[PDB]
From Swiss-Prot, chains A, B, C:
Keywords: Hydrolase, Nucleotide metabolism, Nucleotide-binding. It comes from Anaplasma phagocytophilum (strain HZ). GO terms for molecular function: dCTP deaminase activity; nucleotide binding. It is an enzyme of class 3 (hydrolase). This is dCTP deaminase. It catalyses: dCTP + H2O + H(+) = dUTP + NH4(+). The active site is at E136. One of its GO terms (biological process) is dUMP biosynthetic process. Homotrimer. Pathway: Pyrimidine metabolism; dUMP biosynthesis; dUMP from dCTP (dUTP route): step 1/2. Disulfide bonds: none annotated. Gene3D superfamilies: 2.70.40.10.
UniProtKB/Swiss-Prot annotation, chains D, E, F:
It is an enzyme of class 3 (hydrolase). It comes from Anaplasma phagocytophilum (strain HZ). It comes from the Bacteria. Belongs to the dCTP deaminase family. This is dCTP deaminase. The chain holds residues 1 to 157 of 185 of the full protein. Signal peptide: none annotated. It catalyses: dCTP + H2O + H(+) = dUTP + NH4(+). The active site is at E132. Its EC number is 3.5.4.13. Pathway: Pyrimidine metabolism; dUMP biosynthesis; dUMP from dCTP (dUTP route): step 1/2. Coiled coil: none annotated. Homotrimer. GO terms for molecular function: dCTP deaminase activity; nucleotide binding. DCTP binds at K106, S107, T108, Y109, A110, R111, T130, L131, E132, Q151.
Length: 161, 161, 161, 156, 156, 156
C-alpha cells in the first residue's frame, strides 16, 4: 500500500529515535576527515566496523552461493583493511538497523572510495530487516586499496510511504 | 508528467495481470531454497534462464561496444553456469517484460549472490521497453562463482506516477 | 522537508534553463549512433569528455583514499580511451552540473557499455553540488574495452520534492 | 658423459641419421631458423592451443581436459596475457639412444616476456616437439608460425 | 671443466658417497621418479607453501614475509592460477665439492604451464631442495606429493 | 664440443681477453656478485623497464612498442605481480668466437617467484646483457640495483 519516496533527515531521525531504526545514531555529520558519518540531508552515512573478510583464490574452490566455505576468505581485524586488487572484502556496519515494515533501504558508496575503484555491492534492505549490514566492497582497481574502520563507508537512502 | 515513486506488490500484480507487464508471473514467493523468485513487497524477483555467455580473453580483441564480437565470449547452456574469476556473464531472464509508457524499472541483486562478489550491472528499463532482460553478472571475486538457472537472480523495482 | 521522487523531463528542462542545473543542455536526444545524449523521459544522458585517467599497477603503491597519488594512473587525452581489463578509468562529464538544495541525483550506466562489463560507479550528487561529474568506469571484463569521448556515457536521474 | 655438440655434428646426424627433418644447414630468415654454431633453431608450426579459464576446471596433469584450451590455426597466434600456448615444431626429431636435447628460447621472444618451457628430450625420443610458450607479460603477445621459435642444444 | 654425467656415475655417488638419499636405481611409477639415463627424477614431498596476495605486501627477497603464503600439507597441492608454490624434495642431497646440479621440469607438468624455477645446486651443497613451481596458466593446476616432480642433471 | 668451464678459465679470459668487465675474482657482498666456482654472478644495473597493460597493445616481437612499459631508474625496482621487467647487467661482456654462455637465476630471487628468462649468449656476442625478470608471483617483488642478479655459465 502506498508507493515509496526517498525520505529526509528529519524522518530518518524520528525513526531512529522512536523506533530504534538505526543504533548507534548520530544526528549530524561527525568524525574527522573526508570519511565522516552520521545523518545527511537524505540519508545516513554508516561506519565500517573493524572485522573484515578478505577473499583470495588460495584454496581453488568454486564458490557456491548456496554453501558458504571458510576457505574462500581470511579473517582480519584492525583499524584498516587493505583490499587486494581485483578482489573483495566483507565487513559489517558499526550501526545496527531495524527496518520498519513500511520501509526499504538502498545502499550507496562514498565518493572518496568510489573514485579509487571501490564498488559497494550491498543489495536493498527489505521491510522488517534487522541486523548489522554486511558491506561488500569490491576493489575493481589493479592496485590494493586501503579502507578505514570506524569511519564512514557508505550511505543508506530510506524509501517510505 | 508526474514524478515517480517505488510501487508496491499490488500495483505490480495489477500491471502484470492486466497489462502483461511481467510474464510468466507468480504472485508470491516461490521456489525451493534461498534463491526464491516471484512477487515481493516492493519489487519482483526474476529468474535466471539457462543460456549464458561467458567472457574470456582467449582471442585478444579490444571490445568495441558499438560492434559486438562473437570472439569475446563462449556460449554455455545448462542448469548452472560458473563465472570465472574477475570476468562476467550475460544471460536473459526467464520473465518477459512489457514496461508501460508510465514506468521505469531498476534492477538490483540478491544478497545471496552479492555477498559472493557478484555485481548485477543491469541499467534501468525505460518506459515502453519490451523483452527478456539481459542480465550482466560481474564476478568481482578472485574465485569462480556458481549461478543457478531457473532460480531467483535479481530484483526489479518499479517506479511509476 | 518533503520526500523525493524521480522527476520528469519537463522538470529537468525547467531546472536546466532557469536554474543552470545542467550546462550545456540539449532538450532532446542528440548525436549519431547508439551512444546518444541529452534529455530523456526521466533523466539526462551525459557525455564523456576527452580526458581520462587510466589506472595501472606499475608503481606498486597501496592506494590510500585519503591521499591521492599520481603514480596510480596515467593521463590520456583523445577521442576514445581503452580501459584495460579488470581496471578502471576516471573521466569528467562534458556537462557542468549545479544541483539545487532541493535535489539529489543518481547516476546509472547505458546498456551499450554495461553489456560489455563496464560498471559505472558514480555515487549520488548531493543537494548543492556543483561541478563536472567525475565518472568512474570499472572494466569488469577480462578484455580491454573502448569508450567514446563526446558521446553518451551515463544517465542522471533527478530526485526532488 | 655428455657435452654440447657443434654444428658439424648436428649436420652429420641430421643427414646421415635423420635426427632433424626437414633440415637446413644455415640461418634462414629477427626470427631465423636452421643450423646455428652450437644448436638448431626449430620452427613453430601453425596449430595452437590457447589456454583460458572459461570453464573453471582444476587442471589435472594426469587427466588433461579439452575444456582448458581453444584450438587455433593460422600464420600467427596471440598468446593472452598471463597465459600460455601449446604448439608443435615444424621439424620432426629422431633423438638417438646416444643423445639428450635441451630447449631454449630465442631472445626476440624472451625479451617480450615469453618463456619457453620445454623439458629435455631424452635419448631415443622420436616426434614433433610440443612447445610450451608461457606469456609472463601483462599484455597479449604475438608469435609467428613457420619462423624460428626456440633453439635445441644437443648433448652427447 | 664439467659435463653431464650418466646414470652409472650418479649410481656410484648415490651409494658410495650418499649424494642422493633415498636412492632408487630405476624409474618407479606419467610421474615416475628415480634414476634416469642421464639424471635423477626427484619426488615432491607433501608440504607446500602456496602464495597469495591476501595481505598486500611487497615481497622483499632480503626479508621474506610469512604473510606472503599459506602452508598446506597433503597428498596433492593445487597451485592457484598465475601464482606459485614452494615445496621440498623428498630426497636429501649431498653435492660433492666436485659437482654442480641443474634442475629441469617433467614434461607432464610443463605441458600444463608449470615452470620449475630451481637454480643450480653449487658444489658442496647439502640439503632437501626447495622446488619452486610457477603456475603460468590461467587455471589452477594439481601437483602430486610423493611422485616425480623434476629431474636433476649432474655436471662434473 | 663444449663443457662448463671452471673459475680459473673465466678468470683468465676476463683478464687476458676482457670477456667480462668490470671483473671481480671472488664473491663480494644474500645477493653476492663476482666469480663463482663454475660461473660468474653479474650485477643488475639501475635502469629498468617495467611492463604494464595500460595502453592495451598486442605486443609484436618484430615491432616492439614504447607504450608497453615504463622507464624507471633507482637503487631498486618493484616488479608488479604477474608482470616482468627488463634491465641490463652492470657488466660488459665480450664472448669469444669460442664460447656460449647460459644464464641462470639466483636462489634468493627464484624463491620469490622471479624467473630469469635470458637466452644464451652466442659465440662472438659483445654487449651489456638484457636481463628479463618475470615475476610469477601474485605479489609485487623488490629487486636490487648493483647487487647480484644472475649467474652466467660459460660453455667452451
Amino acid at each position: 500500500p502506498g508507493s515509496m519516496s526517498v525520505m529526509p533527515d528529519h524522518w530518518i531521525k524520528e525513526r531512529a529515535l522512536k523506533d530504534g531504526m538505526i543504533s548507534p545514531f548520530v544526528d549530524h555529520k561527525e568524525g574527522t576527515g573526508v570519511l565522516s558519518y552520521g545523518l545527511s540531508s537524505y540519508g545516513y552515512d554508516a561506519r565500517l566496523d573493524n572485522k573484515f573478510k578478505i577473499f583470495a583464490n588460495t584454496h581453488s574452490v568454486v564458490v557456491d552461493p548456496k554453501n558458504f566455505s571458510q576457505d574462500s576468505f581470511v579473517d582480519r581485524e584492525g583499524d584498516f583493511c587493505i583490499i587486494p586488487p581485483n578482489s573483495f572484502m566483507l565487513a559489517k556496519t558499526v550501526e545496527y538497523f531495524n527496518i520498519p515494515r513500511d520501509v526499504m533501504v538502498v545502499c550507496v558508496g562514498k565518493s572518496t572510495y568510489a573514485r579509487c575503484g571501490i564498488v559497494v555491492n550491498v543489495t536493498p534492505l527489505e521491510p522488517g530487516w534487522s541486523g548489522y549490514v554486511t558491506l561488500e566492497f569490491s576493489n575493481t582497481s589493479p592496485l590494493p586499496v586501503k579502507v578505514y574502520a570506524f569511519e564512514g563507508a557508505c550511505q543508506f537512502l530510506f524509501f517510505s510511504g
